[model samples]
Target: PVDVSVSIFINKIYGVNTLEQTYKVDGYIVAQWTGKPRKTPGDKPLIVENTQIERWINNGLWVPALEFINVVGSPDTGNKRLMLFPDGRVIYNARFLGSFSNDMDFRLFPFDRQQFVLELEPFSYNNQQLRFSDIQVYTENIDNEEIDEWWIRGKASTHISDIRYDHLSSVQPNQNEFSRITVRIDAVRNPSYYLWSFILPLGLIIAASWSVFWLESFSERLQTSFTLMLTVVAYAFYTSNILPRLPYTTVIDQMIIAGYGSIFAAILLIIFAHHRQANGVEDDLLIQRCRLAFPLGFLAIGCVLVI
Candidate 1:
């Protein structure tokens, strides 16, 4: 196994999506290995330019095909480079922009933590063919942290190991294991926008809906409850439009459902309070006073949901 050491310098990370399970990264990749000693100009290190590097590749020099296994599409390549030393050390460097796939969990959404991942493996080689070693990461945090939606927690993390995949094309019994490099960058979402824009506004709507119980007459109270129900439904549609579609609901979605349930409960209570009376002479003032209790009770329930 020719153990190749790899280094990556991350430039930027953006366009992270919880629902799409995708993110974009811009970075430079470097790989180094020892080659047969060469006599250079003045017996020193040889710094070959781009054109000379192409000539070396054309002349059958060893350039390992390290492919990004998790890339969504073709990466946009930038500068290409090669460094050679008299003692036979060779280095390859390149810059790239790629969209990568990483399975993300958005169950806690708005308050979610995510790890962006990049996987690298030899295109058609196994561990015995192209073993990886000493992987290093040098990613920097965002300069203007508050401007972006994601705050990188720390430096990137890296792992180099063998992966065994059950290849359908392989008819042999023992030819599926491969060596790969895995890189992970942890980040947390900036919930400020969603808080002020979605959650806070929705909370106000629910609170306003609860105010209907304070109305003096049964007809006014009952009429306002229906309007509140429609408002919550409309708000839900608005939310669904702005957010990415997901098969499973998130914390915000659950809160929306709670809003609907609270309004519907108010409807049932309003109708019962108007009808449950002796000789049609007394409205259930005791039950009507419970309106004050519902808001604080709902607040307590909301806190529980948050935790």
Candidate 2:
């Protein structure tokens, strides 16, 4: 049996996922050893491609099974590389996707930030026979070669920070250490889709809802406002069906509900004003006042909401 020592050097880490609180990694794992060079059979270490490596991993035949544990979901592995040299040095390079998290509750989505992390270690080995003497995690500026799928720029390009782990070996007998490496990536809000699909449309609906109090007669204002209310309701359902479901109301969902309720409440008030009276004198002050009142009131309510 050949004794091989393995060391992992993270080349680059970037592409933070704010919603999932994750990041991606591009790195290399180096394995070194010494042995009597064989003939054509032991000529050199073989280079295994993508699909074959995945098959080997699935079958439990592959050595040094590494996975990113803190990832939100199973990562997508891409462009695998394996190299074996005559001097008994083996290197593995691949692209990976993983989620890093820190005290996150994505329950209220459309806005969230999360920490991304990369986890690496030999698979199923309690004690790694080959000791990892030194490991380097690079998270700095990309010169020329390191720039690829997801590369970190700025201060985060130099080294991996905030790394913590525990190995099983250092304790007692039969307690093999589960070697691991972690890479972290910090991500912020991804408001692209939210701004376009949700925020913009909800604004239009809310603005349209305030037009209810603009009509002259009570029947014209109240009766037609119900149609607008139903329209807002239909729009609400339509938007809700497609938007991602979340535990708390998104900024846009709140806006949509406000639009529905505002129009419905106007209908009720218009009826009240018409019915609770001595004669049939139209209180133009009440109607006109509501025109500005609801809109400005909405604005004032919004200001208080943030507080």
Candidate 3:
């Protein structure tokens, strides 16, 4: 089996698509191996690139092809070259930008953290015929991380391991073992925008809605709660319109639903106060004065939700 040294140099990690469960990556993949000591004119290293390199590109130099098994679709490949040395060392270098798939969870949304992964495997040969010696990952760090939407946490956790497929098994022995390389990069969401613009204003809206209970008249209290219900619904619509929807709800989503529940409950109790007519069409003084209870009870409930 021929041993290959795999290297991945990441340029930028961006274009995270949540609903589709994918992210884009721009990087260069370098694979080095030997070709049984080649002869050169000057006994020096040779550089062949693009069209000129096609002469030896057909596995003529025994170069093994590496592919990203987790890629969602075809990749956009950039400039590529080959370095041929007198000692038979061959380096295949190419730049690629591709959309890769991942097991993404956006339940926490703005507060969510994520990992970008690369799974490289041989196209045809198994581990017994061709295997990776080691994998090296190099990711660039930015000084102006404050401006970036995602704060990258530096280089990756790498792995060089053997992968076996039960479904792909054949009669041939050791044909099941395939060399694989993995690189994982961690990143965090910059959630400052959501905190200031969405969550803060939402909190104020919920707090302000509670003021409806302070109204003296039954009609006024019920009427104002109607408006607050619509307001809460509209806010939920605004959130749904702008943010990406996911399978599970987020922290902001639960808060918005709490707004709905509060408004609905107020409307029910306000109407009930007038209907329960202790002395025929009279607003119950006790329930009406129970304005403080609503806010306090809800506040306690909100605190419990934090747990």
Q: What is the C-alpha lDDT of each candidate?
A: 0.80, 0.56, 0.80
TM-score of 3: 0.91
Candidate 3 ranges beyond 4 A from true positions? 142-147, 171-174, 241-245, 281-283
Give the range where candidate 3 is weakest over 10 consecutive residues by summed lDDT.
140-149
What lDDT is obtained when candidate 3 is compared to the true structure? Answer: 0.80
What TM-score would each prediction reach against the true structure? 0.88, 0.62, 0.91
Q: After superposing candidate 1, which stretches have Cα over 4 Å from the reference?
A: 41-55, 141-147, 168-175, 277-279
- All predictions: root-mean-square deviation over Cα? 2.6, 6.8, 2.2
lDDT of 3 by residue, 10-92 (tens): 78777777657788888799999877788878977888887777678664666677889899889888888788888978899
Between which residue pairs do clashes occur in model 1?
none
Q: Whose TM-score is higher: candidate 1's or candidate 2's?
A: 1
Count of residue pairs whose backbone atoms collide, per candidate: 0, 17, 0
